[PDB]
Write a protein that binds this ligand. Structure first.
Ligand code: HEM
Length: 124
């Protein structure tokens, strides 16, 4: 069974994407990460969801509409240090605790996001 399947499919991917930004947008420690996002969040909420649907084994909605992830490259316009990586993970940890009831999948998702996040870092 895929992460997409275990999390309830579309509604599960949507809820993660939305909870992530919901928390990012109000939590103090992540203001800096939040401030890199020009408002409103409508499009990035939708795009991140599209990404999650395929990264979890549902429809590649991202690769259908925007092409391959190339996430490291796609983040190269921004300055991303350790500090911002940790802010991003802090938000996604909090999200996955609330959204993923399977504790194995949850720890699996945290580690795999944790790695992707570290991969984006481009300032040391
Ligand atoms: C330190 C880590 C990260 C930082 C600071 C960061 C920051 C950003 C920012 C500022 C954008 C621009 C979106 C906008 O306002 O339109 C963006 C886009 C995006 N981020 Fe991240 N991000 C990070 C890590 C990640 C990770 C780990 C993933 C996926 C697992 C991810 C997926 C995306 C996606 C899919 C987009 C949309 C890209 C596009 O439309 O071409 N990001 N990110």
């Amino acid at each position: 069974k895929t992460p997409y399947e275990i999390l309830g499919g579309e509604a599960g991917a949507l809820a993660i994407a939305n909870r992530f930004y919901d928390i990012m947008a109000t939590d103090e420690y992540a203001k800096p990460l939040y401030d890199m996002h020009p408002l409103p969040l409508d499009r990035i909420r939708q795009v991140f969801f599209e990404f999650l649907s395929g990264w979890l084994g549902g429809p590649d909605l991202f690769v259908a509409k925007h092409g391959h992830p190339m996430l490291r490259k796609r983040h190269m316009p921004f300055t991303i240090d350790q500090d911002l990586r940790d802010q991003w993970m802090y938000c996604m940890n909090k999200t996955l605790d609330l959204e993923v009831d399977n504790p194995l999948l949850r720890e699996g998702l945290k580690q795999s996001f944790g790695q992707l996040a570290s991969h984006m870092i481009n300032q040391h």
